Structures are given as structure tokens and as C-alpha cells.
Enzyme design. Structure first.
Site, PDB file in Angstrom:
ATOM      1  N   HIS A 405       0.831  -1.198   0.000  1.00 14.56           N
ATOM      2  CA  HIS A 405       0.000   0.000   0.000  1.00 14.56           C
ATOM      3  C   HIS A 405       0.869   1.253   0.000  1.00 14.56           C
ATOM      4  O   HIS A 405       0.603   2.199  -0.742  1.00 14.56           O
ATOM      5  CB  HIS A 405      -0.935  -0.008   1.213  1.00 14.56           C
ATOM      6  CG  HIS A 405      -1.604   1.306   1.490  1.00 14.56           C
ATOM      7  ND1 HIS A 405      -2.936   1.532   1.216  1.00 14.56           N
ATOM      8  CD2 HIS A 405      -1.138   2.444   2.056  1.00 14.56           C
ATOM      9  CE1 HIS A 405      -3.256   2.760   1.584  1.00 14.56           C
ATOM     10  NE2 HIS A 405      -2.183   3.337   2.092  1.00 14.56           N
ATOM     11  N   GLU A 406       1.907   1.254   0.835  1.00 11.90           N
ATOM     12  CA  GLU A 406       2.812   2.398   0.925  1.00 11.90           C
ATOM     13  C   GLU A 406       3.592   2.568  -0.373  1.00 11.90           C
ATOM     14  O   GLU A 406       3.899   3.690  -0.782  1.00 11.90           O
ATOM     15  CB  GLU A 406       3.785   2.245   2.101  1.00 11.90           C
ATOM     16  CG  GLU A 406       3.142   1.913   3.447  1.00 11.90           C
ATOM     17  CD  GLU A 406       2.054   2.897   3.856  1.00 11.90           C
ATOM     18  OE1 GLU A 406       1.158   2.504   4.634  1.00 11.90           O
ATOM     19  OE2 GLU A 406       2.095   4.062   3.410  1.00 11.90           O
ATOM     20  N   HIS A 409       1.620   4.488  -2.812  1.00 17.06           N
ATOM     21  CA  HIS A 409       1.828   5.924  -2.656  1.00 17.06           C
ATOM     22  C   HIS A 409       3.067   6.381  -3.421  1.00 17.06           C
ATOM     23  O   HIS A 409       3.089   7.477  -3.978  1.00 17.06           O
ATOM     24  CB  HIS A 409       1.972   6.304  -1.180  1.00 17.06           C
ATOM     25  CG  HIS A 409       0.701   6.204  -0.393  1.00 17.06           C
ATOM     26  ND1 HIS A 409      -0.489   6.741  -0.827  1.00 17.06           N
ATOM     27  CD2 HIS A 409       0.446   5.647   0.816  1.00 17.06           C
ATOM     28  CE1 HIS A 409      -1.430   6.511   0.073  1.00 17.06           C
ATOM     29  NE2 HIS A 409      -0.887   5.848   1.078  1.00 17.06           N
ATOM     30  N   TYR A 447     -11.669   2.504   3.827  1.00 17.13           N
ATOM     31  CA  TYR A 447     -10.627   3.507   3.996  1.00 17.13           C
ATOM     32  C   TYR A 447     -10.253   4.148   2.662  1.00 17.13           C
ATOM     33  O   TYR A 447      -9.787   5.287   2.620  1.00 17.13           O
ATOM     34  CB  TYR A 447      -9.386   2.899   4.652  1.00 17.13           C
ATOM     35  CG  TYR A 447      -8.273   3.905   4.813  1.00 17.13           C
ATOM     36  CD1 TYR A 447      -8.413   4.990   5.670  1.00 17.13           C
ATOM     37  CD2 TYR A 447      -7.094   3.784   4.092  1.00 17.13           C
ATOM     38  CE1 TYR A 447      -7.404   5.922   5.811  1.00 17.13           C
ATOM     39  CE2 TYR A 447      -6.078   4.709   4.228  1.00 17.13           C
ATOM     40  CZ  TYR A 447      -6.239   5.778   5.085  1.00 17.13           C
ATOM     41  OH  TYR A 447      -5.226   6.699   5.222  1.00 17.13           O
ATOM     42  N   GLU A 454      -5.336   7.726  -1.037  1.00 22.38           N
ATOM     43  CA  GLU A 454      -5.601   6.456  -0.366  1.00 22.38           C
ATOM     44  C   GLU A 454      -6.375   5.491  -1.256  1.00 22.38           C
ATOM     45  O   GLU A 454      -6.147   4.279  -1.219  1.00 22.38           O
ATOM     46  CB  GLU A 454      -6.365   6.685   0.942  1.00 22.38           C
ATOM     47  CG  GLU A 454      -5.631   7.560   1.948  1.00 22.38           C
ATOM     48  CD  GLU A 454      -4.268   7.009   2.329  1.00 22.38           C
ATOM     49  OE1 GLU A 454      -4.041   5.789   2.178  1.00 22.38           O
ATOM     50  OE2 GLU A 454      -3.419   7.801   2.783  1.00 22.38           O
TER      51      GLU A 454
HETATM   52  C1  LIG Z   1      -5.355  -0.344   4.876  1.00 20.44           C
HETATM   53  C2  LIG Z   1      -4.024   0.251   5.253  1.00 20.44           C
HETATM   54  C3  LIG Z   1      -3.922   1.085   6.361  1.00 20.44           C
HETATM   55  C4  LIG Z   1      -2.695   1.641   6.711  1.00 20.44           C
HETATM   56  S1  LIG Z   1      -2.576   2.599   7.987  1.00 20.44           S
HETATM   57  O1  LIG Z   1      -1.198   2.664   8.393  1.00 20.44           O
HETATM   58  O2  LIG Z   1      -3.374   2.086   9.065  1.00 20.44           O
HETATM   59  N1  LIG Z   1      -3.058   3.987   7.578  1.00 20.44           N
HETATM   60  C5  LIG Z   1      -4.473   4.317   7.427  1.00 20.44           C
HETATM   61  C6  LIG Z   1      -5.281   4.463   8.698  1.00 20.44           C
HETATM   62  C7  LIG Z   1      -4.744   5.010   9.858  1.00 20.44           C
HETATM   63  C8  LIG Z   1      -5.533   5.120  10.997  1.00 20.44           C
HETATM   64  C9  LIG Z   1      -6.854   4.680  10.980  1.00 20.44           C
HETATM   65  C10 LIG Z   1      -7.391   4.129   9.822  1.00 20.44           C
HETATM   66  C11 LIG Z   1      -6.601   4.022   8.685  1.00 20.44           C
HETATM   67  C12 LIG Z   1      -2.121   5.049   7.207  1.00 20.44           C
HETATM   68  C13 LIG Z   1      -2.620   6.433   7.613  1.00 20.44           C
HETATM   69  C14 LIG Z   1      -1.849   5.041   5.727  1.00 20.44           C
HETATM   70  O3  LIG Z   1      -2.721   5.366   4.937  1.00 20.44           O
HETATM   71  N2  LIG Z   1      -0.636   4.664   5.331  1.00 20.44           N
HETATM   72  O4  LIG Z   1      -0.105   5.167   4.145  1.00 20.44           O
HETATM   73  C15 LIG Z   1      -1.572   1.349   5.948  1.00 20.44           C
HETATM   74  C16 LIG Z   1      -1.676   0.518   4.839  1.00 20.44           C
HETATM   75  C17 LIG Z   1      -2.904  -0.031   4.492  1.00 20.44           C
HETATM   76  F1  LIG Z   1      -3.005  -0.836   3.419  1.00 20.44           F
HETATM   77 ZN   LIG Z   2      -2.030   5.466   2.836  1.00 22.12          ZN
END
Ligand SMILES: Cc1cc(S(=O)(=O)N(Cc2ccccc2)[C@H](C)C(=O)NO)ccc1F
Ligand SMILES: [Zn+2]
Ligand SMILES: [Cl-]
Length: 495
Positions: A405-406, A409, A447, A454
Site C-alpha cells: 500500500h505504501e 503511494h 478507507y 488512499e
Molecule cells: C489499509 C491500510 C492502512 C494503513 S494505515 O497505516 O493504518 N493507515 C491508514 C489508517 C490510519 C488510521 C486509521 C485508519 C486508517 C495510514 C494512515 C496510511 O494510509 N498509510 O499510508 C496502511 C496501509 C494499508 F493498506
Molecule cells: Zn495510505
């Protein structure tokens, strides 16, 4: 159970007697962090901010923890208007600022969160300096070592929640068919790469083992070194110096009171000894992966920022996360994007400290209320991927999938960069994808709805899932997004 309190007490007799009233108050503060008072927070708010807070659906927010949500909900009740008995964009920014001011003053939590990097600009300057003064003064109090007369005559005990080390594994550690049992399979994964451990705060331990309380299935048994400094807190309890190393000697399943627990035997060693192992590992994983990715031999890409109690697993899981990464993304896409990241001194940071304390974030995020702690993160200004070991991403199976996922980005970054190199921007900020997001943004993960960035990263993650079902699912439910991402990939490998 009580036969050893007396000689520890006598050993620290002079130390306890010479304790200043300020020293005692300090130790007390360490043990019981100062909670925020409801009325203090309420009175500090303007009349408009009061009216705003009482209209806000607190449970809807995604950045507020359970604890923070409950406290704010209590404020809502205490704030009384005419209806009282005898998320938006405005509301998100308010809550993000207010979050910073409802944190309890917790010295041990500050040390753990920062991994000892207490100068990290992740909290307001005034409380940041107060932490520094307290910590320095505590270090000065803990000056008497356990010594050669007692170091190998006692064990020190600590009960711990599994979620403190790994919330991912912690979700399944207990047998779901019988809560008195430990899941043998999840046990093995927890134990597999648990060889060493670091304490960056002050361990509060007991001379005799004590019953576990709510959600504690880990029962530490620790031997100190002669040089290990500590203080006696009475009642058979010790507080240890910070920055100590721990070698894991044994991890076993044991039965107490017809319930199964996990025994963790550990020996105190110099922290420098453990840090050396971590650096050699960082040196090794970089040499290995520079060769695999075809990067220059001198490239520093992978970084270990570890300071806490599950240290060895953070290091070892990095190898596993990156392998899955290389296995589920096409090699030519990986080479192009990674080189772009490297060209900006970007890093893959694996850590067990909270992400606002990672330099690759806070260097480019002065606003504390805009700082983020999560399982994973990508920062374009530093072109770095951050992965937080111990936590558990909501609606996210494992660390490998978080990383992908990162990397989504990062793909987003490079694709937008290729369109315009000097006026660099994300490709998700282009009108074309914005339109695609406005149309299909609600068709994937919950999300994914958050924003363009995202949605892209979620679509990307799912498109590279090991489940051949989830890939088709994205194509079917978000065909324009699916096409767009493939178009960017084609754009990247042909660049
Ligand atoms: C689904 C998912 C989530 C995250 S994550 O680390 O949990 N995340 C989102 C988030 C955080 C808190 C509350 C809800 C959601 C962060 C913010 C994210 O978008 N990473 O780039 C990282 C990677 C991923 F694939
Ligand atoms: Zn993200
Ligand atoms: Cl035992």
C-alpha cells in the site's frame, strides 16, 4: 513469595532514606501518569468550540484512539446547553488539534514512543522540555546498582500485554475455542525470531511473580547484571534504569491457575551489545537488497530504527516484508520506483517507535496536529516508506500488505513526477484521477473512500494481492481506477 523483599529493601535502605521529597514526587509521577482533567479542558475552550464539540459525532473519527474517543465523549456530556437534562472538514481539524492536549503526562510512554529520542518534535515544546528534565532527574536517582551480592539471587518479574510487542499476532494468540489456552501456532510465530529485546524506558518489576491482570498472557522472568541500576519502590517492587539490553534465553508455554501463559526468560546485557547486532543486520540487509534490486553497492536504502521490547522481530520481519513485496509486484515497476526514491535519498524505515518520532516524517511536518502515527506511511518530501512493527492496521491483515500500500503511494508519486519533473506533484492530484475518484471512490475498501491518494494506494494493494479473487474484484468494481493504475505502471516502466 515474600522472603526476599527484606534484603532488597535493606540493600537500598540508604538510597530510600536519602530520597528528596522532590525525588519521591518524581517516582510517584512515573508510576501514575497525570490524566487530563475534564473541567480543565472544557474551560479552556471558547464558546464556539464548546458548541462545535457537542455537535460532533466523535465515534465517526478515524484518527482518534478508543481512549481518546471515550474521554471526548465524556466532555460532550459535561458540556451543558439548553437541550441538557435537568466527519466534516472543520470538525476534523479541530479534533486533530484538541487530541494533542488531552494526552496524559506519561514519562514511560514518552520514552517508549520516542525510543529515547526525546528531542523529537512530536509534542509541544513546553511539555517536551518537562519530559527531558524529569527523565534526566530520574536517571540521576537510579544510581545504585543491584550489585554482586544480589544480582544472581533474585529474579525480576513483569506481566505484559502481547499487543505491546505485536498487535497483529496478538489478535490470535489466545485460543478462540478456549480462552484458557494459547494458540500453539501463533505462539510459534511470536517466538520464532525473538532473540533480543530493548527497554528504552523504566521497567517496573517485582521480586516475586504476580498474577496477570486483564489481557496479559506474557509473564517475563528477568535476571539483572551486577551493574544494572535500580531503585526500590517498597512492596517488593523495583524500578530499573532505562536503556538496557535483554537477551531472550527461553520462551515457553506454561500453565498457571488452569490458564496458559507465555513464559519469557531474559538476561540483562549492555544495550550497546544489542545495538551492534542491529547495525550488522542493517548492513547485511542493505548489501543483500542492493544486489537484488541492481542498486549501487554503496546505497543506503533500508534503515532500522528500533528501541523497544520486540526489537529482534522488527529486524527479522523486514526481510520477510520485502520478500513478499518483491514477490507480488513486477520487477520492472519495482526497479524504476525504488531508483526514484533512492535518487532523493529515500529510505525504507522499519521501526518500533511511533511514526511522528521518525525523522523521515517530522523533518517535513512541523505541525504536530498534522503528524501521523500508523502501521505504515509514505512521505514524498523524504521519499520514504515507514513501517511500524508492533501496531495493527485496521482492516489490514499483515505488514507485507501494508508495505505494498505504501509502495502504491510511491508509485503515485513517481507517475505524477514523470508528467512534470520540476513542477512535481502526485498523479492523484490530477483532474483526471480526481474525476475517477469521485465516481468509483466508494467501490473498494472503506478507507479507500478517504481521498484520492488512499483510494489509489488501496486499489494498488488489492491489485497485487496474492488472492487472484481480489484482483478481479477491483477490476470489476473499479474498472476506471484499475485501468488508470495499469496506465501509470506502463508509463513508469517505459520512462
Ligand atoms: C489499509 C491500510 C492502512 C494503513 S494505515 O497505516 O493504518 N493507515 C491508514 C489508517 C490510519 C488510521 C486509521 C485508519 C486508517 C495510514 C494512515 C496510511 O494510509 N498509510 O499510508 C496502511 C496501509 C494499508 F493498506
Ligand atoms: Zn495510505
Ligand atoms: Cl515457569
Amino acid at each position: 513469595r515474600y522472603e526476599k523483599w527484606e534484603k532488597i529493601k535493606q540493600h537500598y535502605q540508604h538510597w530510600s532514606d536519602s530520597l528528596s521529597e522532590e525525588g519521591r514526587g518524581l517516582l510517584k509521577k512515573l508510576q501514575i501518569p497525570i490524566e487530563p482533567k475534564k473541567d480543565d479542558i472544557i474551560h479552556s475552550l471558547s464558546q464556539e468550540e464548546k458548541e462545535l464539540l457537542k455537535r460532533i459525532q466523535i465515534d465517526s473519527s478515524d484518527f482518534l484512539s478508543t481512549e481518546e474517543k471515550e474521554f471526548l465523549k465524556k466532555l460532550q456530556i459535561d458540556i451543558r446547553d439548553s437541550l441538557s437534562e435537568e466527519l466534516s472538514e472543520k470538525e476534523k481539524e479541530f479534533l486533530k488539534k484538541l487530541k494533542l492536549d488531552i494526552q496524559p503526562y506519561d514519562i514511560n510512554q514518552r520514552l517508549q514512543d520516542t525510543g529515547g529520542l526525546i528531542d523529537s518534535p512530536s509534542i509541544n515544546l513546553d511539555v517536551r522540555k518537562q519530559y527531558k528534565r524529569d527523565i534526566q532527574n530520574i536517571d540521576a536517582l537510579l544510581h545504585q546498582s543491584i550489585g554482586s551480592t544480589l544480582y544472581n539471587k533474585i529474579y525480576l518479574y513483569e506481566n505484559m500485554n502481547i499487543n505491546n510487542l505485536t498487535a497483529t499476532l496478538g489478535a490470535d494468540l489466545v485460543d478462540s475455542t478456549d480462552n484458557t489456552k494459547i494458540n500453539r501456532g501463533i505462539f510459534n510465530e511470536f517466538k520464532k525470531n525473538f532473540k533480543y529485546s530493548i527497554s528504552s524506558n523504566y521497567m517496573i518489576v517485582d521480586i516475586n511473580e504476580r498474577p496477570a491482570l486483564d489481557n496479559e498472557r506474557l509473564k517475563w522472568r528477568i535476571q539483572l547484571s551486577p551493574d544494572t541500576r535500580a531503585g526500590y519502590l517498597e512492596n517488593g517492587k523495583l524500578i530499573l534504569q532505562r536503556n538496557i539490553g535483554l537477551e531472550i534465553k527461553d520462551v515457553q508455554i506454561i500453565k498457571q491457575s488452569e490458564k496458559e501463559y507465555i513464559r519469557i526468560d531474559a538476561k540483562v546485557v549492555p544495550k550497546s551489545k544489542i545495538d551492534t547486532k542491529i547495525q550488522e543486520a542493517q548492513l547485511n540487509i542493505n548489501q543483500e537488497w542492493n544486489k537484488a534490486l541492481g542498486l549501487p553497492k554503496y546505497t543506503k536504502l533500508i534503515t532500522f530504527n528500533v528501541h523497544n521490547r520486540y526489537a529482534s522481530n522488527i529486524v527479522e520481519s523486514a526481510y520477510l516484508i520485502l520478500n513478499e513485496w518483491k514477490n507480488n509486484i513486477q520487477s520492472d515497476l519495482i526497479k524504476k520506483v525504488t531508483n526514484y526514491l533512492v535518487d532523493g535519498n529515500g529510505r525504507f524505515v522499519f521501526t518500533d517507535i511511533t511514526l511522528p518520532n521518525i525523522a523521515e516524517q517530522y523533518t517535513h511536518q512541523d505541525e504536530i496536529y498534522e503528524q501521523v502515527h500508523s502501521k505504515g506511511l509514505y512521505v514524498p518530501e523524504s521519499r520514504s516508506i515507514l513501517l511500524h512493527g508492533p501496531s495493527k492496521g485496521v482492516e489490514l491483515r499483515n505488514d507485507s500488505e501494508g508495505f505494498i500500500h505504501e509502495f502504491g503511494h510511491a508509485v503515485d508519486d513517481y507517475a505524477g513526477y514523470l508528467l512534470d519533473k520540476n513542477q512535481s506533484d502526485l498523479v492523484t492530484n490530477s483532474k483526471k484521477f480526481i474525476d475517477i475518484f469521485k465516481e468509483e471512490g466508494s467501490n473498494l475498501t472503506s478507507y479507500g473512500r478517504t481521498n484520492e491518494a488512499e483510494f489509489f494506494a488501496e486499489a494498488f494493494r488489492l491489485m497485487h494481492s496474492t488472492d487472484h479473487a481480489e484482483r478481479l474484484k477491483v477490476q470489476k468494481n473499479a474498472p476506471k481506477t484499475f485501468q488508470f493504475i495499469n496506465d501509470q505502471i506502463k508509463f513508469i516502466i517505459n520512462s
